[PDB]
Design a protein around this nucleic acid. Structure first.
Length: 70
RNA sequence: AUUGAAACAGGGUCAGCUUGCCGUAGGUGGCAUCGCCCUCGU
């Protein structure tokens, strides 16, 4: 259906929270038809240096997911 | 008898481990400072 990415973020202190990708801006969460686009998207996020926020434990984990077509 | 009274952004985390400005290339070739006059006049 609609392929996309699940986003998880681990903070120091056992807590941690979840949100998709594409919730940054006016555009809603972004939708890819093919898993290949999602794989490339994962790669290009993994490419760069990662700048930690405050009270952040380690580099985030992305996993791939297809969401039922909205 | 104040929608008041009490209310830590806290606890730590190397910018690091390294690389030749090198190998050469001319200040040369060459033109007379010359041609000339009193120290006399007692």
């Amino acid at each position: 259906s609609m392929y996309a990415i699940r986003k998880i973020q681990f903070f120091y202190g056992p807590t941690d929270k979840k949100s998709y990708v594409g919730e940054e801006a006016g555009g809603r969460r972004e939708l890819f038809k093919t898993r290949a686009e999602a794989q490339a998207r994962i790669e290009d996020l993994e490419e760069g240096v990662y700048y930690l926020a405050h009270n952040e434990s380690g580099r985030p984990d992305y996993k791939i997911v297809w969401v039922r077509g909205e």
